[PDB]
Amino acid sequence: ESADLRALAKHLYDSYIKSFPLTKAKARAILTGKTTDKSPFVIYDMNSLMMGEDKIKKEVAIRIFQGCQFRSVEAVQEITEYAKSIPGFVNLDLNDQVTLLKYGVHEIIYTMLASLMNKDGVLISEGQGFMTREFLKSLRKPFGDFMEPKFEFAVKFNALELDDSDLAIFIAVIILSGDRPGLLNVKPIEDIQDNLLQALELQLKLNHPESSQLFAKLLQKMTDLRQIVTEHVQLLQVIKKTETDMSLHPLLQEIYK
Numbered sequence: 001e002s003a004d005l006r007a008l009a010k011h012l013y014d015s016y017i018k019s020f021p022l023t024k025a026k027a028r029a030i031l032t033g034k035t036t037d038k039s040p041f042v043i044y045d046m047n048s049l050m051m052g053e054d055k056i057k058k059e060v061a062i063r064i065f066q067g068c069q070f071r072s073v074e075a076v077q078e079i080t081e082y083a084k085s086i087p088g089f090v091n092l093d094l095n096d097q098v099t100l101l102k103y104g105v106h107e108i109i110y111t112m113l114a115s116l117m118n119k120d121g122v123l124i125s126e127g128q129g130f131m132t133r134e135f136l137k138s139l140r141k142p143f144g145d146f147m148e149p150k151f152e153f154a155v156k157f158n159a160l161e162l163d164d165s166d167l168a169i170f171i172a173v174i175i176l177s178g179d180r181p182g183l184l185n186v187k188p189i190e191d192i193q194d195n196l197l198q199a200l201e202l203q204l205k206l207n208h209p210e211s212s213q214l215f216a217k218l219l220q221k222m223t224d225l226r227q228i229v230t231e232h233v234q235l236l237q238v239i240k241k242t243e244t245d246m247s248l249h250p251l252l253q254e255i256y257k
């Protein structure tokens, strides 16, 4: 029944709004001058970077990098709260639950990162600030190319014009992979994902009826996520070797194995 699929979609959207304080709908209202929300202080160089705490509640590159790192640990926390709400996920073997998160968590971070980006920069501090792509790329090596592959993806991805009710099901599909390395019981995972994929497919054609093959173009985007993740991992191993004094969160170290 299509009707059970819509109920699942409604359930996941509601759980996505409850788990993530900054939705794409809010992010786009901030980014584009809407009166439902307020304007971000823009950071484009070092003076505005230090002017930035005068509005938004060590060297500059390592400080920015370690805040982006604190934020990621926070998103991991929000993603795990979302994941538990995906029907059947808490019912799986605990070891497989850990494996799905470990491998799914960064692909979801960069999907939702895209909600907070345009070609020019990225919202920070829950929408209160905006950090210019040009500033980030001007950071000293090896940090200037830290964010550029996320912007390249985001610009391509934001072109699909997905909204939060689409994204809620898509990030569920990402978690419930079943081709993840080290999974004990693949088949229960594949059964949950086949359901999510049916819910996503219906959602896309009801919400985007004039968008030809949007289901397939979005599933292809999963290729770009995998490559962002693997590049970021390699870049981190270079930062850790040249910056032996920069501390990495154990939660992120446990995932990066």
Ligand SMILES: CCc1ccc(C(=O)COc2ccc(C[C@@H]3SC(=O)NC3=O)cc2)nc1
Pocket (backbone or CB within 6 Å): 063, 064, 065, 066, 067, 068, 070, 071, 122, 123, 124, 125, 126, 131, 147
């Ligand atoms: C590289 C892409 C990116 C993503 C998110 C952020 C953020 O920074 C947004 O969320 C925030 C904002 C501000 C801080 C302050 C940090 S935190 C600390 O430990 N000392 C500080 O100055 C922490 C987190 N930046 C960059």
Ligand SMILES: CCCCCCCCC(=O)O
Pocket (backbone or CB within 6 Å): 052, 053, 056, 057, 124, 125, 129
């Ligand atoms: C985004 C510019 C403000 C820098 C520090 C913001 C507060 C730090 C935090 O929330 O962890």
